[PDB]
């Protein structure tokens, strides 16, 4: 392999270098938006981000060791979770608001609202824990590798091995930050429990996405539609 030989610091470096860019939406304050067009901005943005996520995924240590069929499955399972954690990450410093894009900052008003509050709560959680960028990238890689791991047998073993290595990287980062062993274990658990909520938010989002398809008013890209199809 290659992801199994990396040091914790090399792992973090690689992940940081692989970070995707922050894209803009097509939001225009002069243009009046209907509920549909508002969601249009978000779906349009997600579609453009997906191309960058796919290329970011290739850069996640151990990901390219998988068969194309397994890579496809992992992304089909994790894409919305990955977009969401990216959202809450860049929303940390914007309490009571979500930073969908540099030109699209929204609060619960104007803001479906249940999911919005869950994202707000998640971002709020990260802020209080003072989540570090190094930790964030580790968490996002875990989502990619874990979300679809239970949906040959040697592939999953390799996946679990890589996941173990990211845990070692997380602990390494926390120890480096001066946390006692107890504090490391507690923080590790805290971060991983948040992934349960991220999964929940993704599940609910996938349902709303399906609804949007059936209503046929909010434009959905071919890729987005194929992503939804795989999910069900």
């Amino acid at each position: 392999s290659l992801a199994l030989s990396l040091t914790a610091d090399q792992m973090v470096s690689a992940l940081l270098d692989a970070e995707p860019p922050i894209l803009y939406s097509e939001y225009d304050p002069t243009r009046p938006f209907s509920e549909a067009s508002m969601m249009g901005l978000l779906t349009n943005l997600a579609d453009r981000e997906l191309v960058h996520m796919i290329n970011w995924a290739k850069r996640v240590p151990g990901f390219v060791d998988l068969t194309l069929h397994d890579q496809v499955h992992l992304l089909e399972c994790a894409w919305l979770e990955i977009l969401m954690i990216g959202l809450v990450w860049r929303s940390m410093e914007h309490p009571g608001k979500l930073l969908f894009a540099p030109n699209l900052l929204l609060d619960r008003n104007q803001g479906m609202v249940e999911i919005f509050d869950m994202l707000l709560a998640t971002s709020s959680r990260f802020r209080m824990m003072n989540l570090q960028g190094e930790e964030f990238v580790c968490l996002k890689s875990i989502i990619l590798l874990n979300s679809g791991v239970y949906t040959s047998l040697e592939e999953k073993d390799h996946i679990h091995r890589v996941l173990d290595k990211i845990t070692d990287t997380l602990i390494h980062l926390m120890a480096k930050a001066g946390l006692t062993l107890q504090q490391q274990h507690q923080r590790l658990a805290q971060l991983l429990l948040i992934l349960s909520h991220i999964r929940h938010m993704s599940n609910k989002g996938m349902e709303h996405l399906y609804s949007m398809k059936c209503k046929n008013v909010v434009p959905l890209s071919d890729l987005l539609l194929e992503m939804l199809d795989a999910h069900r």
Partner: peptide
């Protein structure tokens, strides 16, 4: 499908 070929290239 799309995801497949985007990953392939």
């Amino acid at each position: 499908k799309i995801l497949h070929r985007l990953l392939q290239d």
